Design a protein around this nucleic acid. Structure first.
Length: 121
DNA sequence: GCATGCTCTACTGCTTCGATATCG
DNA sequence: AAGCAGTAGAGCATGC
């Protein structure tokens, strides 16, 4: 999903805005709203953040309503580092580095939030 | 609940050894 | 062909 969101930019130019909304709506109601404590849906959060970063690369004109969901998700993934296994504690690092690469190459009116995600972490 | 720790037949394969086929 | 050694695909048991 998050990989082929790339080449679907040149085919619809609205489905890139349809994803990152469907994606964040799937991402919210799995580990923020319900079953935050008792669930096993934790071992795919690197794929989640990798997908959101790979669609946020191509998505211009940010909605500015879902960034308090993005930066309430990525501190959850920084929090949930040691409930893991080796050779996936590096995949989690690649996901977080990818997201921080993503939301810093578009505008300095945005990247003040990169200073409060690490403060919250 | 997915991750790590003992355990039981048992399938593949190494080694010798005798026969068979082939070439000079 | 006969013998024999070995290891692996699997089965029970316990953990943050």
């Amino acid at each position: 999903y998050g990989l082929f969101a790339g080449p679907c930019k040149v085919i619809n130019a609205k489905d890139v805005d349809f994803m990152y909304v469907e994606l964040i709506q799937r991402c919210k109601q799995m580990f923020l709203t319900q079953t935050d404590t008792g669930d096993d849906r934790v071992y795919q959060m690197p794929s989640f953040l990798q997908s959101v970063a790979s669609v946020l690369l191509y998505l211009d004109t940010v909605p500015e309503v879902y960034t308090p969901v993005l930066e309430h998700l990525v501190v959850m993934q920084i929090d949930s580092f040691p409930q893991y296994s080796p050779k996936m504690q590096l995949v989690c690092c690649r996901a977080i580095v990818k997201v921080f690469l993503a939301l810093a190459a578009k505008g300095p009116v945005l990247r003040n939030c990169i200073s409060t995600v690490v403060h919250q972490g």
